[PDB]
Amino acid sequence: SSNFGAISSVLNDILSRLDKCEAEVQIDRLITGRLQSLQTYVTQQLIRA
Amino acid sequence: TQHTSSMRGVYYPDEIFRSDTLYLTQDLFLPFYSNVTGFHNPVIPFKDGIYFAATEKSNVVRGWVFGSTMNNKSQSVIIINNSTNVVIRACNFELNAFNCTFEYISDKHLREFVFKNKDGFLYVYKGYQPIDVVRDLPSGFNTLKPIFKLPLGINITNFRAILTAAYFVGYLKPT
Amino acid sequence: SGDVVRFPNITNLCPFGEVFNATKFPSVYAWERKKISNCVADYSVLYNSTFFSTFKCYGVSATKLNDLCFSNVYADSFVVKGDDVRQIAPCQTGVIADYNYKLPDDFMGCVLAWNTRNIDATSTGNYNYKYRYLRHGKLRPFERDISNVPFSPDGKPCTPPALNCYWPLNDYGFYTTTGIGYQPYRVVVLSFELLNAPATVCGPKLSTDLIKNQCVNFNFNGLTGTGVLTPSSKRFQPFQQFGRDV
Amino acid sequence: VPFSPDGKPCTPPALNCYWPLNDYGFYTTTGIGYQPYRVVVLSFELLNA
Amino acid sequence: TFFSTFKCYGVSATKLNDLCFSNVYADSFVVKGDDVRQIAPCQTGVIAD
Amino acid sequence: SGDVVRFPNITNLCPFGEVFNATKFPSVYAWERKKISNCVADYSVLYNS
Ligand SMILES: *[C@@H]1O[C@H](CO)[C@@H](O[C@@H]2O[C@H](CO)[C@@H](O)[C@H](O)[C@H]2NC(C)=O)[C@H](O)[C@H]1NC(C)=O
Numbered sequence: 001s002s003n004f005g006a007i008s009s010v011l012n013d014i015l016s017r018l019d020k021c022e023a024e025v026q027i028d029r030l031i032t033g034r035l036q037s038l039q040t041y042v043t044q045q046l047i048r049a
Numbered sequence: 050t051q052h053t054s055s056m057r058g059v060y061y062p063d064e065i066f067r068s069d070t071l072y073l074t075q076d077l078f079l080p081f082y083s084n085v086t087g088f089h090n091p092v093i094p095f096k097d098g099i100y101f102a103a104t105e106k107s108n109v110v111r112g113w114v115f116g117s118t119m120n121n122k123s124q125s126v127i128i129i130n131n132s133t134n135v136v137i138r139a140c141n142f143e144l145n146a147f148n149c150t151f152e153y154i155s156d157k158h159l160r161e162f163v164f165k166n167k168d169g170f171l172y173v174y175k176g177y178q179p180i181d182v183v184r185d186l187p188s189g190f191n192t193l194k195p196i197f198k199l200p201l202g203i204n205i206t207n208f209r210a211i212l213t214a215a216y217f218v219g220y221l222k223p224t
Numbered sequence: 225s226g227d228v229v230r231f232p233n234i235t236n237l238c239p240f241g242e243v244f245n246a247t248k249f250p251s252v253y254a255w256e257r258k259k260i261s262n263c264v265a266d267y268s269v270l271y272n273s274t275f276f277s278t279f280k281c282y283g284v285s286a287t288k289l290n291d292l293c294f295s296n297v298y299a300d301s302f303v304v305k306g307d308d309v310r311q312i313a314p315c316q317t318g319v320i321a322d323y324n325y326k327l328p329d330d331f332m333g334c335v336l337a338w339n340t341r342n343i344d345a346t347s348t349g350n351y352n353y354k355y356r357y358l359r360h361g362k363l364r365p366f367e368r369d370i371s372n373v374p375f376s377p378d379g380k381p382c383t384p385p386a387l388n389c390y391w392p393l394n395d396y397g398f399y400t401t402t403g404i405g406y407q408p409y410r411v412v413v414l415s416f417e418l419l420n421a422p423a424t425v426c427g428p429k430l431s432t433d434l435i436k437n438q439c440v441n442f443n444f445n446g447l448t449g450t451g452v453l454t455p456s457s458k459r460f461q462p463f464q465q466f467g468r469d470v
Numbered sequence: 471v472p473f474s475p476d477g478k479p480c481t482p483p484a485l486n487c488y489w490p491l492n493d494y495g496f497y498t499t500t501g502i503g504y505q506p507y508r509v510v511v512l513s514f515e516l517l518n519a
Numbered sequence: 520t521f522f523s524t525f526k527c528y529g530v531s532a533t534k535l536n537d538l539c540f541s542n543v544y545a546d547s548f549v550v551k552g553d554d555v556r557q558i559a560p561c562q563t564g565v566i567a568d
Numbered sequence: 569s570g571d572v573v574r575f576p577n578i579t580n581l582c583p584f585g586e587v588f589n590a591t592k593f594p595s596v597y598a599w600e601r602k603k604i605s606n607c608v609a610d611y612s613v614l615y616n617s
Pocket residue numbers: 117118204205206360361362363364367
């Protein structure tokens with residue numbers, strides 16, 4: 001539910017009102033944040049294991 | 050005679066629908082257990098938004114006037130209720146009317162309001178409660194629903210009630 | 225594999241003939257605000273009549289204004305000169321942004337301005353449109369100050385016959401023999417919201433029948449998505465258009 | 471071909487039938503915004519060829 | 520020839536002297552003054568539609 | 569809760585009269601450089617001229 005500095009946290013809200021030229025930088029801020037959140041989860045799970 | 054406002058005057062800080070959540074927000078609110086000034090009609094200041102509570106039994110208070118200088122050199126909005134329907138007019142009144150834009154005609158007790166002016170919009174929130182006979186603002190907790198926002202692009206820095214009871218005024222602070 | 229497009233029952237066209245083609249726009253210091261509701265914002269019937277020098281949208285994209293659907297739209301109209309069109313923007317300073325008309329930092333809308341020298345300019349001069357150039361402090365966003373009291377730098381009232389007393393409104397002097405930098409321009413600023421309330425004004429997209437239990441691309445009031453559609457037993461508020469999760 | 475909003479052929483003597491080509495009317499006494507401009511668009515590739 | 524507009528996408532105009540292309544296509548036409556802004560990627564109007 | 573603004577003891581207004589209003593500027597190939605010191609840069613007295 002976090003947006004990581006983008007206009008909104010919903011990926012179907014950026015693609016609904018931004019063209020293919022402006023939405024490249026807004027999507028690529030959500031992908032990086034969600035990737036690092038998943039990586040933090042995997043590191044914590046490895047230490048717990 | 051100053052009184053306290055205990056857990057009173059909680060409005061909706063935005064217009065986003067959200068349910069079954071917990072929201073931690075930083076906004077202009079009336080702080081809990083804060084001072085309120087009670088009047089049993091001076092030109093009261095309007096610092097950042099007000100909580101205006103009217104404890105009335107025979108409809109003494111009716112409407113407000115908001116302005117900058119309360120002259121005919123500045124825009125001023127009146128929101129009164131002439132016993133039938135509510136009228137809203139923003140003109141250069143002589144506190145006749147000229148050079149003016151907005152107009153809107155729409156068709157013991159405690160009536161409590163929150164007025165907030167931001168981004169050229171005057172937000173008015175309203176709440177109601179069946180008080181018993183007192184001489185003080187009672188404790189409790191009543192949330193305030195949003196009734197209407199007006200596109201009045203003016204500075205509001207003074208206000209003044211319009212009478213034909215008592216009323217309490219408190220100022221909003223960023224908390 | 226599929227497309228589902230659902231839009232409300234709106235058929236009226238928005239008043240492009242009364243907001244863009246009017247006999248006189250107001251001055252910049254007394255800009256006029258008008259509400260637009262319950263119509264179909266086409267933007268394609270203007271290709272034959274009105275040619276736009278500036279058309280820039282903030283918070284949305286201009287190519288996506290046909291399949292996006294708004295809640296309420298406000299139009300602010302006024303007249304500036306040629307090189308003051310660059311100050312009708314967020315995050316800007318100057319004489320129009322300070323003392324006449326200020327846009328919010330988090331503005332979401334469209335600024336559109338076009339040149340009118342055939343109707344707003346006269347051979348002898350059109351000294352009707354005025355702007356304010358003296359004021360005690362700047363303006364909060366989306367405010368206006370149509371007062372005409374004389375100005376004194378110390379902060380006391382005076383008579384403009386006396387010294388250090390000035391009238392605070394200058395006249396735009398428009399001619400027919402001057403470059404674009406001092407030629408009249410009509411400006412319209414449109415403000416959108418896109419809330420959860422039911423929609424009033426939006427663009428010309430044809431509707432398609434509902435396809436259920438299939439992986440489709442749907443479009444409900446400008447909400448692009450992908451997924452299967454099933455009948456629901458949920459309970460909404462009377463004003464709600466969608467619901468979300470944790 | 472002449473244009474008709476319903477999507478059927480028509481003759482432009484009739485009604486709701488238009489020729490879909492306007493003429494640019496260029497004069498020597500008009501501002502910069504309605505003066506002729508020549509445009510050249512250059513496309514590069516930068517391949518391994 | 521004095522250029523009123525000279526904007527390069529995907530490359531930089533200062534780097535067109537030490538850069539070497541594979542094939543270049545030139546598309547030429549004439550527009551009016553305030554339609555030069557519609558020759559851009561991700562644009563709308565009457566020239567771009 | 570409080571505001572503290574401290575600025576040096578400068579009261580002169582910068583030469584907006586001698587910089588922006590001169591009888592001639594140099595050509596672009598022989599551009600002129602001038603130093604500005606010890607004044608208050610208003611930028612708001614130019615709204616009239
Ligand atoms: C709305 O009106 C008030 C009062 O007229 C304005 O407050 C003035 O602000 C200037 C700023 O320097 C002061 O010099 C004046 O002394 C203030 N007035 C008074 C009576 O003290 C206020 O600025 C106006 N709102 C806006 C947005 O300009």
